[PDB]
Amino acid sequence: REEEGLPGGPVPRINWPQEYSSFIDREPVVAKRIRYDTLASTTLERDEKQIES
Amino acid sequence: DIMVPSFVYNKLPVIHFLQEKRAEQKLRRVLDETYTEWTEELDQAHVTDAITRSLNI
Incomplete structure (x- = not known):
């Protein structure tokens, strides 16, 4: 997804x-x-x- | 020269048998008291939840 460049955080299936x-x-x-946009941006x-240390 | 030697010879088999049984008993104890310990570690979902709360979301 980083190679795709898409938002790292999960995105809900909403309209x-x-x-x-x-x-x-x-x-x-x-x-x-606001919450989901912030979540998808983090x-x-x-x-x-x-x-591990 | 005669008597004590003969009675020692008569003793030998029983003592050998009993010591073999004792050694078997101790190894049996070695394996009996071994258990696999499964450790439990803090679920990362709570860590993710706390991270979200810190963001003020």
Whole structure:
């Protein structure tokens, strides 16, 4: 995936245009996008040399 | 020269048998008290969860 260059973190299978329609209020929808966008932009890895050490 | 030697000779077989049994008993104990110890290590999912919380997500 690094060779692909795609977001390292997991990305949920979501269609936000549908979520926009479904939700009555914007605020929870926006918050959800903020979290997932941040999650997909962060690498969840620990240095395994120090861990083994 | 005669008596004590004869009785020692008579003793020999039983003592040999008993000592062989004793050695077998001790090796049997050696293997009996061996167990494979499976260690448990902190699941990395909790580490990932704590990392997420630190990000303020």
